[PDB]
């Protein structure tokens, strides 16, 4: 399928009109990954940093584009996003505990189309840890506590495996395009991984996607693949015929994955087990804005209140946004009787926080 990008422009830390902060352009939920994001100053183009291409569980992509510094001394900052699902470039102005382990794979049908044909990134608790592409075929760390606790023989061993998996992904892609009787620009995605619940429960998953839509889903309990297609059903019969491979996948997800997860958790016990509380700010521009800055972990709940019940009508959700420090921020708005009290409710460590915003 094809999905339009969702865009939000915000600052890392609350602006001070003198304190140089970081401008952020979060572009997420899009597919295909063909995109270019530009930060703007009164229309002019600014040199900005762009993060690695990252993947969500729903097969969509997301990028964090940020400028080195913005003091915000009486100017107009915006963002330019051009995508295949857009006719004209969209403009957005700036105005002011269960642990998991995931491994993704992104394959692009030949030729390059500008993008690396194969990309593999690993995540623990949505922290990037590993990276690999078909351009520079190298096992690379994306966390400090990853490289420091893994000897160079580990990355050399997996850089070889990845080269094998890269080639295998390329063949599977051609095999799919032939089955679907079409050629050209097509994408292929894989996501494997497990998660450790707070109580001790564990779960695991293996999924495949073609062109951003669900293709094959594996069930480790009944040792079977699920297909939602007449084409994906073909591969299902091939894969299910190999009972030993199905068994091997169950073992990896249940035993081997969990083992790796706990191993990496001990490595990053400092960053992954921490809790930083949110700083709540309230503003008005009618419309009342409630912000929450620099919290961790991402799990959070915010809602506006009226005397003092939750407001469902005329509200905006915002969603969980990356801050850039390794922390996160969100926001909730409400459009506006007599003598009514409007206050923002936030729960993190829970720990219920309330900030009184407005009254008559």
């Amino acid at each position, epitope marked *: 399928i094809q999905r339009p990008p969702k865009i939000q422009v915000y600052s890392r830390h609350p602006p001070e009109d003198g304190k140089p902060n970081y401008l952020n352009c979060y572009v997420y939920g899009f597919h295909p990954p063909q995109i270019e994001i530009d930060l703007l100053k009164n229309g002019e183009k600014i040199k900005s940093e762009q993060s690695d291409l990252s993947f969500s569980k729903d097969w969509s992509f997301y990028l964090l584009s940020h400028a080195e510094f913005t003091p915000n001394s009486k100017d107009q900052y915006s963002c330019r996003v051009k995508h295949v699902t857009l006719e004209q470039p969209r403009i957005v102005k700036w105005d002011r505990r269960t642990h998991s382990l995931r491994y993704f794979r992104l394959g692009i049908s030949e030729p390059g189309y500008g993008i690396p044909e194969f990309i593999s990134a690993g995540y623990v608790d949505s922290h990037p840890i590993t990276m690999y592409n078909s351009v520079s*075929q190298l096992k690379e760390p994306r966390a400090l506590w990853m490289e420091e606790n893994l000897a160079p023989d*580990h990355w*050399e*061993r*997996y850089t*070889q*495996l990845l*080269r*094998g*998996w890269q*080639q*295998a992904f390329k063949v599977e892609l051609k095999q799919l395009q032939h089955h679907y009787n079409h050629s050209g620009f097509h994408t292929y995605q894989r996501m494997i991984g497990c998660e450790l619940l707070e109580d001790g429960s564990i779960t695991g998953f293996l999924q495949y996607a073609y062109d951003g839509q669900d293709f094959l889903i594996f069930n480790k309990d009944t040792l079977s693949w699920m297909a939602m297609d007449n084409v994906a059903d073909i591969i299902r019969r091939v894969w299910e015929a*190999n009972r*030993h*491979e199905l*068994q*091997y*996948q*169950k*073992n*990896w997800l249940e*035993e*081997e994955c969990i*083992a790796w997860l706990k191993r990496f958790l001990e490595y990053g016990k400092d960053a992954l087990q921490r809790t930083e509380p949110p700083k709540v700010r309230v503003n008005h521009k009618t419309t009342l804005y409630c912000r929450a800055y620099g919290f961790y972990p991402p799990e959070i709940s915010i809602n506006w209140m009226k005397n003092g019940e939750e407001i469902f009508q005329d509200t905006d959700y915002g969603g969980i946004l990356p801050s850039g420090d390794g922390t996160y921020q969100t926001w909730v708005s409400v459009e506006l009787q007599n003598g009514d009290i409007y206050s923002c409710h936030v729960e993190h460590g829970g720990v219920h926080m309330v900030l009184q915003g407005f009254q008559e």
Partner: antibody
Amino acid sequence: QNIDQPTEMTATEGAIVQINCTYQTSGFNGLFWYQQHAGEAPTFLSYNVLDGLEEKGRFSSFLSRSKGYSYLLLKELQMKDSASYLCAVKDSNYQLIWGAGTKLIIKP
Amino acid sequence: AGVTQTPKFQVLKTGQSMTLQCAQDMNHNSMYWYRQDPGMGLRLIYYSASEGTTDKGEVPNGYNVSRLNKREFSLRLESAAPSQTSVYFCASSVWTGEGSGELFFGEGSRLTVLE
């Protein structure tokens, strides 16, 4: 890191033999049994990942991930069964650790 | 089909160079070279996950390797040593990093190096 199995075993034709194999590795991604006739290529016999038994004809292989234990069970021994039996385990990284095989001598 | 390996027997004087040929007819991607010795399990000298890439194994000392095709994988030893007396096996599998994927061996190559 380590994998052990008997050096030699001797059994009569028509009988039943059991070759044990014990391993202690970093991780576990499967256990293979290979048959190798003297002066010839080793060939794949059986494979185990999950706990339990795997039966293919007269040959059956058992695995216990907790114990790190596996046995190859040969029933109704024929003369052609006389060979070396190689036990092998996939490491946490997908490398393959080979134990020095068990030579089986079949008496008519 | 099968995994073809040449030669089966070779005698060498210490210091001689020699190369072993291995051809795989099964359209496989991973290829290996093993070294079988009495009292020891198979040891991997060099391997290749797919064409274009190769890497050292458990005992790479004194050996060289090259992947010509997707079909051919050659073992080269430029300066033969008496310690290199063994039975070399060329093996082939569909993929590396797979779990249940078995190995396909060649008939075997008997090597004895003498002073």
